Amino acid sequence: VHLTPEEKSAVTALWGKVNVDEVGGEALGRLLVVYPWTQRFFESFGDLSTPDAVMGNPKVKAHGKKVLGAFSDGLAHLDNLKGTFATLSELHCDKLHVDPENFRLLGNVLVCVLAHHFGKEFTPPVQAAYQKVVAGVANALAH
Amino acid sequence: VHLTPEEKSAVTALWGKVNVDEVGGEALGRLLVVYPWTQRFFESFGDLSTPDAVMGNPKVKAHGKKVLGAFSDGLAHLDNLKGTFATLSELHCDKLHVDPENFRLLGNVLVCVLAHHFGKEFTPPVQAAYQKVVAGVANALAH
Amino acid sequence: VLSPADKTNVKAAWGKVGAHAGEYGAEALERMFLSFPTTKTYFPHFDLSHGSAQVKGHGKKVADALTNAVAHVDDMPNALSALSDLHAHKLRVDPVNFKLLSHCLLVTLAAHLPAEFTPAVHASLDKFLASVSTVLTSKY
Amino acid sequence: VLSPADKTNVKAAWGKVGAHAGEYGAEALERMFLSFPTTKTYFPHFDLSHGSAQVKGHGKKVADALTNAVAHVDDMPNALSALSDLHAHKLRVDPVNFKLLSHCLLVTLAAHLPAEFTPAVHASLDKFLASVSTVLTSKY
Ligand code: HEM
Ligand code: HEM
Ligand code: HEM
Ligand code: HEM
């Protein structure tokens, strides 16, 4: 994904301060809460009825850690997103049957989580840069 | 678009009996009628208020002929849809700013028009083959 | 949101559909599984071949639900509550699948009623099926 | 369709939003224009630079519309009839743009109210904005 030098520097600087252990779980739990039909793919994670049970699930936290690791791996290879997410796209398309719209929803939830965690430091330009990186990850996964 | 030899033979045989002048115009008119926000792009064409005015528009008929000619050109190059629909993709994205969902909507309307014009000869396998061809045209245009 | 005009069009179109509702629903289910095989994952216990008795029965059930929705267009959320709690609460169906099934129903109605499927009727049925899908995809 | 619980959550969240509505709406419009430049085509007579008085005024109008929609959440279709006609019959806005603006409003609310934006409140506001967008995009 093509980014300006300012956008790349801002994105790297803001991702350097991201607490992975909490942010990944926050994004996954908020996806499962706001879009409840996504719990069909995570029914094996245990209790996912109430928001307080979704957000306090160790399996959800670990899976969000994995998701943020994948997002960081993609952020380190912005010019090769399609090749970076080949195995993950195959896994999601052939074995799990996850619709491509779910990736966009998860990216939007992650952007909302980043805005929640960083407040005024999440300016509209930083949000635009993160929007395009999230869209690139979603299009790479949908391929 | 990957197709079986039977699917390609079925697609080509149905296409030969397709009346371009009627089919393209009817698909575009049904798009404009069912999804009225699409008339923002077609405001130059003329009166587009009533369904009878949308269907009885010579500009709509001519533009539908152009659209179905592009569809035929895509069918003739089904293994090179992305390269065939590059100029049109650039035209629709850079100059017209058409949302990619609109291509999917128009493809679905075209499939409905084909079903309407071919009746019982539009079997579920033929519809599946045409759904895949329409999706490939839409993905090549949205690139 | 529906107007009086498309409500009248939908009621007339489905009344003219009448007794072929079961066959139309079976064909709609068959078309959707072949066109979009991802939707087959919601029916792992079914026999998804052509002419299957289970698919025909589920098509009959879907068509009966659609007829009831036509008869109760102005109070759809309070009419289809059992189906709303079924698909959203337990099945957890993605609304994309509802869109696909609505499209396949439209294709079946176009292929079986040429004279009935006028462009206005097409818009009316599209909006009616969208309302039904929105009712079935909501939580109370 | 909204439940009582998320409706109460939305009412409380907007009541705690309070008087910063104009600035929040202006920031949401700025975020939408910056991250989704295709939406700038609906405002060709506007000055879409940062700190624009025209964008601030439009954000104030959008925020007031959201406030009266919060006040009239139970009967949205007829309380937003004038706006629904302008968006659908006159402007003909793609509902994708409504989804984009709803997302930008959620991002603005997350950035400006950390304590208020709980995961439940997030879901309630998401579906409230979805209902508002559906009402404004419906043509009736
Ligand atoms: C959009 C960006 C996404 C990224 C970067 C991502 C990343 C990943 C990664 C790295 C794994 C590997 C986990 C492992 O190997 O144990 C995984 C698995 C998985 N993903 Fe995603 N994912 C995304 C979207 C989604 C969405 C939106 C859903 C569902 C709505 C989903 C459903 C799943 C499931 C069910 C698994 C398997 C979990 C398990 O078996 O325990 N993914 N994902
Ligand atoms: C598979 C989908 C589509 C195909 C194959 C297609 C094809 C075409 C073709 C062949 C042209 C003529 C360009 C030229 O002659 O230089 C065109 C122009 C145009 N298209 Fe599309 N189109 C598609 C979808 C859409 C949709 C869904 C919309 C709007 C909602 C749209 C809006 C337009 C407009 C406004 C023009 C220019 C009309 C004019 O200049 O008078 N297109 N397209
Ligand atoms: C307008 C759209 C739809 C209508 C009116 C509808 C209606 C119905 C009806 C009447 C039943 C029977 C309930 C019962 O026998 O207890 C049912 C069950 C079911 N529906 Fe739907 N449905 C729709 C869309 C969908 C879609 C798109 C899917 C999946 C892709 C789906 C998945 C299911 C499943 C898995 C069942 C359970 C069937 C069984 O257990 O035998 N539904 N639906
Ligand atoms: C989602 C909730 C929305 C609300 C509550 C809302 C509300 C409003 C309000 C209150 C006005 C002022 C009308 C007047 O002063 O006469 C307006 C105008 C307008 N809206 Fe929206 N709107 C929404 C979404 C959108 C979106 C997403 C777009 C485009 C991407 C849009 C496009 C416009 C345009 C172009 C105008 C005309 C402004 C002007 O001519 O100065 N609206 N809207």
Numbering used by the authors:
A (entry chain B), B (entry chain D): 1 to 143
C (entry chain C), D (entry chain A): 1 to 140
The authors write:
Here, we present a workflow that utilizes the SPT Labtech chameleon – a next-generation nanospray cryoEM grid preparation device – in an aerobic environment to freeze O2-sensitive proteins under functionally anaerobic conditions, which we term (an)aerobic. Demonstrating the utility of this workflow, we determined high-resolution cryoEM structures of deoxygenated human hemoglobin (Hb) in various liganded states and the molybdenum-iron protein (MoFeP) – the O2-sensitive catalytic component of Azotobacter vinelandii nitrogenase – in a reduced state. Our workflow maintains (an)aerobic samples by protecting against or eliminating O2 contamination prior to loading into the chameleon, during sample aspiration, and throughout sample deposition on self-wicking EM grids, respectively. Finally, we detail the effects of O2 contamination at different stages of the workflow and show how to prevent their effects. Together, we demonstrate reproducible high-resolution structure determination of O2-sensitive proteins of varying complexity and size – as small as 64 kDa – with a workflow requiring only minimal modifications to a robust, widely available EM grid freezing method.
As monitored by UV-Vis spectroscopy, metHb has a Soret maximum at 405 nm, indicating that the heme iron is in an oxidized state (Fe3+) and incapable of binding O2. To eliminate these possibilities, we next assessed the effect of the protective oil layer on grid preparation and downstream cryoEM imaging and data processing using our metHb sample. Briefly, we created two metHb samples – one without and one with the protective oil layer – by placing 15 µL of metHb (~ 125 µM) each into two sample cups. One sample was used without modification (non-oiled), and ~ 70 µL of aerobic Al’s oil was carefully layered over the second sample up to the brim of the sample cup (oiled). Two cryoEM grids of each sample were prepared using the chameleon following recommended guidelines. Both metHb samples were imaged using the same microscope parameters with approximately the same number of micrographs for each dataset collected. We did not observe any noticeable differences neither in the quality of the sample stripes on the grids nor in their behavior during data collection. Both datasets were processed independently but with similar steps and parameters to allow for a direct comparison of the resulting densities. A comparison of our 2.78-Å resolution non-oiled and 2.71-Å resolution oiled metHb EM densities did not indicate any notable differences in their overall quality. Indeed, the view distribution and the total number of particles were similar between the samples, each resolved to a similar resolution and demonstrated similar map-to-model validation metrics. D, E Comparison of metHb densities determined with or without the protective Al’s oil layer detailing no obvious differences in the metHb densities between the sample with oil present or not.
